[PDB]
């Protein structure tokens with residue numbers, strides 16, 4: 001029957017980005033990776049099978065894929081090649097994705113707003129907002 005993340009499931013395309021270069025700088029991404037990653041217009045493909053959620057992020061820069069159970073830490077290699085320990089939870093209908101590495105932390109929130117999927121990436125005081133629409 002109907003379930004936890006139904007409104008997230010599907011194929012989404014990036015339509016706007018703000019402050020992503022600054023977010024990446026704060027994370028520690030180097031110049032060349034920032035330039036090429038920042039150009040990209042990824043799709044995000046979200047699916048659910050039982051308790052397992054899969055998020056694929058695909059662009060001309062990189063294809064990534066994570067599968068996880070809410071609340072259960074996992075290893076992730078990010079598109080910029082960080083090796084992080086991640087935990088994703090649902091907080092009042094928002095997917096909250098925390099990545100920990102080298103004593104640092106970043107949080108990515110994904111939420112449904114109208115017909116969009118809005119992604120907010122936060123590293124210390126710097127936020128990037130990335131808006132997706134259905135493909």
Ligand SMILES: Cc1cc(S(=O)(=O)Nc2ccnn2C)c(C)cc1Cl
Nearest residue numbers: 037040042057058059061062079080
């Ligand atoms: C590097 C990077 C990538 C992302 S992403 O948007 O999920 N994926 C992305 C960007 C460009 N191509 N692809 C697949 C995010 C949220 C953060 C960071 Cl630092």
